[PDB]
Every structure is written in C-alpha cells, then in structure tokens.
Design a protein around this ligand. Sequence first.
Ligand SMILES: N=C1N=NC(N)=C1/N=N/c1ccccc1C(F)(F)F
Ligand SMILES: [Co+2]
Ligand SMILES: [Co+2]
Ligand code: NA
Length: 263
Amino acid sequence: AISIKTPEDIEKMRVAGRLAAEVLEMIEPYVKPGVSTGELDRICNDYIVNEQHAVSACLGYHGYPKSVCISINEVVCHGIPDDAKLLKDGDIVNIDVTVIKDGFHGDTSKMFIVGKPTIMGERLCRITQESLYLALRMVKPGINLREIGAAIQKFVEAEGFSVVREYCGHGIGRGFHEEPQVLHYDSRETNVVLKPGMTFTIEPMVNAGKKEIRTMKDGWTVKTKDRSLSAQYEHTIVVTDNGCEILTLRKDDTIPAIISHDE
Ligand SMILES: N=C1N=NC(N)=C1/N=N/c1ccccc1C(F)(F)F
Ligand SMILES: [Co+2]
Ligand SMILES: [Co+2]
Ligand code: NA
C-alpha cells in the first residue's frame, strides 16, 4: 500500500528534505575534536525548531530521547547524544536527521570524519557512500527493489565489508516509515517495482568487519558484534518518470540532484 505522492506532496518532500539536508550542512563546522555529541544534538534541535520551524521526528519515537541520532565508530545506529561523549581524532561519525515540516518527513544522514582521518574509516566511509550513489543511479520506473539491494551488497562485499540486515531504507511521506521496505541486500522476499511518485530512503549500514550487530544495555545503542567500524549515509528520493530526484542533497554531495535515464 505504497502511496504515490501528488505534485504538491512532492513539493513538501523537497522542502522537508532540504530542511533535513540543511541541518547537516549547518552542523559540520561544529564537528571538531573535543566537542560532545550531547552538544551537537543541542545545536541541531535548536536550529530545527527556532530557525527552521520544524520538529524532530526522532524525539519520542519509540521513546527516543534526543533530537538526532549520532553514532560513533563501531556504533552502527541509534547512538545517544551524550553531553559526556566527546569526539576524538580519527573518529568516524554518523548523524541522522529526520524532520517533519508541513506534515511531510525528510530523512537523511552522513558520515563526518573528525580531525585527522585514518586510512580505514576514510575508506569504509567512501565505499559506504559509493554504495548509496550506485543504488541512487538505478532508481527509475520499472526497476525492481530487489535489483538495487543485490547491487549494494556485491559492491560492499567486494571490498571485504558486510551489509547490516536488521535495518533498511523505507517509504517516507506523512509517515516516518511507510511501505516499501528498502533492503540493502537480496531477498526472494523483495519484489517491488518502482513507479513515478513513490518516495523512499536508501540508507545502507556497512560494517568494516562482520555483519552481526548487538544492542546495548540502554535499549538504544546498536554496536558491531565484533567492534569493527560501521558506517551509514542516507538519502530520501522521489521516483520520476525517467529516474529519480534526490530530495536531501547537500552542497557536499557529488551526485546530481536530478537523475535521468532518458535520451
Ligand atoms: N530507519 C531509519 N532511518 N532513519 C532513522 N532515524 C530511522 N529509524 N529510527 C528509529 C527507528 C526505530 C526506533 C527509533 C528510531 C529513531 F528514534 F532514531 F528515530
Ligand atoms: Co534517517
Ligand atoms: Co531513514
Ligand atoms: Na559507526
């Protein structure tokens, strides 16, 4: 029961996506060594609310206590903005912003690397993003979700990394999570054939080591089961008549906003 967004609806996604991508533009300057994840959440929430005049879709969603998730190193997802957590040299850092504005969600996230990169997180972060872009490039009317998922996996495995299975991109709209599920791997289960006007996310979680994850005592923080690094990027898109438009693109992104397969 995939909604097909209207024109007016799609225009609201664009706004909401820009909003969400703008939070992540805003925050980069403040992503330095010595800063606290607790501090960043403070910063993004103030902005979301006061400046952007939007709400976090994070906050109180299943009891989520903070306004953005911010995962570090071997934290895979849903890390908790913690006033005592500080960023060190060498850290790979995901911050996931999801925003509602005028009743539509925008949902995006990115890796920041902090101070002096290391070769390994410099790399895992690169593949992770290329595995998103690869997939972004496949989206068009009549392709199957299954193809996309299979493709992300191969890319990712060929580099000696694994795709986290527990999480998936998703339908998005008036709801955070809508059909379809966007698995980032192959499944006889998946058989979705895309149509002009579906909105959804692509957001592969990629581990440097093995694909097994583990939730912490706090009920929230997911880690690598082998403490290997993990990394994620996410975008929201609309399928178009000839391809896709990416609705949460940033100035720092290197793929076009509009993507066409037509002649
Ligand atoms: N699937 C997701 N893509 N972006 C997000 N923020 C996603 N999920 N967030 C979840 C999922 C379950 C429970 C709580 C959250 C929260 F709060 F981080 F948003
Ligand atoms: Co997100
Ligand atoms: Co998402
Ligand atoms: Na991580």
